[PDB]
Amino acid sequence: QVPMLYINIEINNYPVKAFVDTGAQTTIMSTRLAKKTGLSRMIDKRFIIGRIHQAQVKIETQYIPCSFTVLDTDIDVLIGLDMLKRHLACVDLKENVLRIAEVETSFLSEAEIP
Amino acid sequence: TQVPMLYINIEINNYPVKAFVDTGAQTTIMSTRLAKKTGLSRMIDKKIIGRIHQAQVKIETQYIPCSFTVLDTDIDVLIGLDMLKRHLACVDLKENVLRIAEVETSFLSEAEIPK
């Protein structure tokens, strides 16, 4: 009960379903997604497995600089409060749509949810 | 590079409460401590944990029905996606305000945040 919040995003052209978590301190990308997208080579292991500082995430028709902390997990991408605030977003549950940057994308349906 | 989490003021059986707004949480939670203090623990549908089906939560000037899962935790009230969807809210990070039910309230500053 209670379908979680997800949005569609593209990283290096790879389509991804991202979980929107306001209770999370930082945005995260899975090691395997970093691999698949080729972002593995840009992982700053300056010490969790490393951090990708300003990758270009695509949401709708806009590329936005998002920072990810790479972790070995089943969740490919977790949009945290840190990134939610940076791009002054609005989690509109009434309109069931996410508004981030200068764009506005919808929340995946129960089915389209991973 | 820290960021203050999302909290808002609410009242439960008249007691002021700093509540955490977590879209990552499926279920809204109320601590055993708060439940016992406010007395809502007597409505708990079950070591005082269980389920509160209906409770009037005051946000700004409106009283709205909410359900809680009472667990022994530190956070006194964690508002989950379940209640954020039930009351068709909007987590406006541009204005640092929460629009829920037929009301609008702002988030607490790092100073107001519980610790």
The residue among A22, A66, A88 with the most chain B CBs within 10 A of its CB, best to mutate, is: A22
Long-range contacts of B98-106 (CB under 8 A, 24+ apart): B98/B6, B98/B8, B98/B21, B99/A94, B100/B59, B100/B64, B101/B59, B101/B62, B101/B64, B102/B62, B103/B59, B103/B60, B103/B61, B103/B62, B104/B60, B105/B8, B105/B9, B105/B59, B105/B60, B106/B8
Which structural technique was applied?
A: X-ray
Token reading at B108: 């607490």
What is the extent of the structural domain holding A73? 1-114
Contact in structure between A14 and A57 (CB atoms under 8 Å): no
Mutation to test the B interface, candidates A94, A98, A108, most B Cβ within 10 Å: A94
Domain count, chain B: 1
The CATH code of the domain that includes A22 is 2.40.70.10
Q: Which residues of B touch A21 (CB under 8 A)?
A: 22-24
Query: How many Å lie between the alpha carbon of A42 and the closest alpha carbon of chain B?
Result: 20
- Cβ count within 10 A of residue A94: 13
Nearest to A69 by CA among A49, A42, A87: A49
A92 is catalytic: no
| Max CA distance (Å), chain A | 41
Bridge partner residues of B99 (DSSP): B90, B104
> What is the strand order of the sheet A97-100 is part of?
A103-106, A97-100, A90-92, B90-92, B97-100, B103-106
- B60/chain A closest Cα distance in angstroms: 19
